[PDB]
Ligand binder design. Structure first.
Ligand SMILES: CCOC(=O)[C@@H](F)[C@@H](O)c1cccnc1
Ligand SMILES: CCOC(=O)[C@@H](F)[C@@H](O)c1cccnc1
Length: 130
């Protein structure tokens, strides 16, 4: 229905706003674009599903996300990719792990404060009807 298409349009507006707020935070710069294969040729052989905030904006606009749960699976993948590629005790690895955990926690805290639980349940029930 038109009303269901208006529901998904409101979901996309919400997700673009959360993603922009993460992308302007200086702590999260390393997560804003894909890894450059020139600078890091090893990356795409270790990490099997790369993800970054520019790719997330592209996916929102391609209508890939019909629920906040499916958006949060991609935020979780940005975080888990950084934890697995950078697992060592040295300061450069510990700094990116702390930033990855902060990106994940910040996204979940904005959604807890600003997403209505009944709006998410509506999106889940339209998705499940298709
Ligand atoms: C693509 C939208 O571009 C902007 O407006 C930026 F300010 C910011 O939103 C941003 C940067 C990088 C990745 N995703 C979002
Ligand atoms: C996931 C679908 O989108 C793509 O594959 C790329 F275009 C995307 O990663 C990208 C990078 C930098 C600037 N704008 C978009």
């Amino acid at each position: 229905s038109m009303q269901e298409e208006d529901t998904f349009r409101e979901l996309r507006i919400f997700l673009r706003n959360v993603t922009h707020r993460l992308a302007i935070d200086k702590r999260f710069r390393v997560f804003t674009k894909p890894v450059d294969p020139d600078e890091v040729p090893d990356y795409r052989t270790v990490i099997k599903e790369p993800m970054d905030l520019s790719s997330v904006i592209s996916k929102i606009d391609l209508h890939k996300y019909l629920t906040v749960k499916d958006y949060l699976r991609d935020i979780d993948l940005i975080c888990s990719n950084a934890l697995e590629y950078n697992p060592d005790r040295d300061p450069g690895d510990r700094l990116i792990r702390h930033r990855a955990c902060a990106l994940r926690d910040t996204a979940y805290a904005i959604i807890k404060e600003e997403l209505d639980e009944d709006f998410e349940q509506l999106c889940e029930e339209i998705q499940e009807s298709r």
